[PDB]
Amino acid sequence: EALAPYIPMDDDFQLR
Amino acid sequence: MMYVKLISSDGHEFIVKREHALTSGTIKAMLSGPNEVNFREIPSHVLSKVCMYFTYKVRYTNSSTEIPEFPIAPEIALELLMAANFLDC
Amino acid sequence: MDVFLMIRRHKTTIFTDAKESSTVFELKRIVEGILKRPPDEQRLYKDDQLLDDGKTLGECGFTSQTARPQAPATVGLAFRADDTFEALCIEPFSSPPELPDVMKP
Amino acid sequence: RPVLRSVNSREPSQVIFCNRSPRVVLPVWLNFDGEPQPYPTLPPGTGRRIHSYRGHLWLFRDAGTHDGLLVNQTELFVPSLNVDGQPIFANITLPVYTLKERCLQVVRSLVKPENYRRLDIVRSLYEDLEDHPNVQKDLERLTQERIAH
Numbered sequence A: 001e002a003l004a005p006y007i008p009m010d011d012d013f014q015l016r
Numbered sequence B: 001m002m003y004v005k006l007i008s009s010d011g012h013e014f015i016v017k018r019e020h021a022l023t024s025g026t027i028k029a030m031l032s033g034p035n036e037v038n039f040r041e042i043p044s045h046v047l048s049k050v051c052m053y054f055t056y057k058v059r060y061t062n063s064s065t066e067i068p069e070f071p072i073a074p075e076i077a078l079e080l081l082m083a084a085n086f087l088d089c
Numbered sequence C: 001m002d003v004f005l006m007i008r009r010h011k012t013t014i015f016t017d018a019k020e021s022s023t024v025f026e027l028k029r030i031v032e033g034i035l036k037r038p039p040d041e042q043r044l045y046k047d048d049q050l051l052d053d054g055k056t057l058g059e060c061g062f063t064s065q066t067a068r069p070q071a072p073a074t075v076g077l078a079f080r081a082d083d084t085f086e087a088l089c090i091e092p093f094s095s096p097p098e099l100p101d102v103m104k105p
Numbered sequence D: 001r002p003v004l005r006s007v008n009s010r011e012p013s014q015v016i017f018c019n020r021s022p023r024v025v026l027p028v029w030l031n032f033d034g035e036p037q038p039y040p041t042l043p044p045g046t047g048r049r050i051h052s053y054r055g056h057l058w059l060f061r062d063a064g065t066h067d068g069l070l071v072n073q074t075e076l077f078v079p080s081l082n083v084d085g086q087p088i089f090a091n092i093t094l095p096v097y098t099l100k101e102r103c104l105q106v107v108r109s110l111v112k113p114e115n116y117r118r119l120d121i122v123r124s125l126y127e128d129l130e131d132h133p134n135v136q137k138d139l140e141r142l143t144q145e146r147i148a149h
């Protein structure tokens, strides 16, 4: 069975 | 270090580190034998930006740091493109 | 860190870098090696402000964050001819032409 | 069977995409047959947690132009097993473009392709403008270079 990457429903964050 | 002098079409003189000027494949080939270089075809508003690119390339090549964009104003892009094509950098 | 500079006098522009912690006097020594004029025959400027020999470049207002390789900060340079120092004069570069029609929105 | 492809490890690996570039970044996942797949884009200066897998292959491009970008200073990023819960960082950056290719990017951004050959520039540059960045052509190049080593 093939498992593709996915993105958790979560806010992005800012880099500094 | 050692330095070379690049002359633009309107007589502006740009003195850059020789190592930096070798960023240009054209200049590298001219100086590769066993200084001053005349570029009477390139105006100063273009050649100054070329020297800035030399500094930029030497600084950010082989670096893990965040690389800033090299800025090119729309009104110089065509001449800078032709200068980059001719200088091989 | 390092600051990236254009040292400019008349129609001459020197591209160099220096440490924020290095001094104005040290920068004059750089110019001496390139233009063969000694430090006491030189005056360096940030805009119209004459820079004191003993100040570091950081203390003059030059910071690595703004004096970057692709956008170097300008240092004005004037020479002492015989007895007197010349007035600071930097000739502008050439003017870019109008954008062609197919490059306009 | 292609040389550049993910392996179906099924071993989870937590990863953080850090867009340390001024471009809108398109993450591109190579599937198990080596075909590039797009993932949601990343605004400049932003980071995102990703649920990936060990031995998967990622690459990164400018979303609007497909200009090539680097991840941890190289073309491809491969998640590893998380050590002590710590996710693996993918720091996406601009490469040092040649001045010529940076000039081409700016010209492409201002001139419709149908209008390239109206510019008063040397003839060889028309084809350089037309040869815009292309993921599959880059994948073929990276494959050939790898074989050489």
Ligand SMILES: OCc1ccc(-n2cccc2)cc1
Pocket (backbone or CB within 6 Å): D059, D060, D067, D068, D069, D070, D075, D076, D095, D097, D101, D138, D139
């Ligand atoms: O323009 C330089 C450059 C071209 C292509 C890439 N590239 C990204 C993924 C595969 C290739 C990176 C940098």
